[PDB]
Design a protein around this ligand. Structure first.
Ligand SMILES: [Fe+3]
Ligand SMILES: [Fe+3]
Lengths: 192, 190
């Protein structure tokens, strides 16, 4: 039928001081909503009308893709953040240590990848089909589902994600995000 | 050796279309960072003591990104003005032949600017058949790399407008016409 904007998993000011109420107002309430509205408008009456969002992401192009992948990516992003205390599962910890040397090394690499992404895009931690962990960046609406990789964590690095709160200082934004990373959600995605 | 070039007007001259705050970050930090980064990247390379336009036409990766952004932002600042300007008759003529009318050009150009997904630029350019053309570019993309002649550009990277308009890119694009330097577009087109 129609896609809806998922309910935010916390209050609009739950992520202060890291992300401001105003950012959430715009980012969730306007940008993420616009993607949902556009997706519905574009899908209506096509073969994609009725398909699950992940299939649409995996199999569309043009405007449908851009809007589909952004709806997915933003929902994923809100689930990657939390005002609550969390920690990596023992299994996720062990995987991070074995792949990147330590949890802190992963954070360093991931932060660097996120800071270096040019233009609008996303930084991802993914699990490939062999179960291996990789850092993946995407441009614009790009989503690792289209490469058959399972997303575990994402940082939005489109300027709208940080401009209100950090202006051009993306590194400060990336650094601060670690304080609200939802390691429970990341761990749950890693499981399997 | 590359320098941030002087803005063609005071930092607050484009109010109310573009705020002094936007000029200070956009010009004073973003533009400057591209200049700085480029200087760092070109050093010890073949582009060291090569001109900006030659670097844009002949570089890839990080050098291209920083060089093309330097060029693109200087071009953009020259496309704006606090002063009253209008199109030369030859430019106006060319606009009417290609787009039907000046207003139709502005509609189409606005549509193009608004429709550009992600970060990028909308351009009016002169192509090899001597004709006018609207093209858009992603990220640092520049018409020089297609040997096309840029006449006007709007920056639609979110930093260009987010401070003054938040997500309302169409309001930004609409407001830009108030400050478009038709003398500069006409000189380029000469
Ligand atoms: Fe976003
Ligand atoms: Fe810019």
């Amino acid at each position: 039928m129609k896609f809806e904007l998922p309910k935010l998993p916390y209050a609009v000011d739950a992520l202060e001081s890291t992300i401001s109420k105003e950012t959430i107002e715009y980012h969730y309430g306007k940008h993420h909503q616009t993607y949902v509205t556009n997706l519905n408008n574009l899908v209506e009456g096509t073969e994609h009308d009725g398909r699950n969002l992940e299939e649409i992401v995996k199999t569309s192009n043009g405007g449908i893709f851009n809007n589909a992948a952004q709806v997915f990516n933003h929902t994923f992003y809100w689930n990657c953040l939390t005002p609550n205390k969390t920690e990596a599962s023992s299994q996720l910890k062990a995987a991070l240590i074995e792949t990147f040397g330590s949890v802190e090394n992963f954070k360093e690499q991931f932060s660097k990848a996120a800071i270096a992404t040019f233009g609008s895009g996303w930084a991802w931690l993914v699990k490939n089909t062999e179960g291996k962990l990789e850092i993946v960046t995407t441009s614009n609406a790009g989503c690792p589902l289209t490469e058959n990789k399972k997303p575990l964590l994402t940082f939005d690095v489109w300027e709208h994600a940080y401009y209100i709160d950090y202006r051009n200082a993306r590194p400060k934004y990336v650094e601060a995000l670690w304080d609200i990373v939802n390691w429970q959600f990341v761990s749950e995605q890693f499981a399997d």
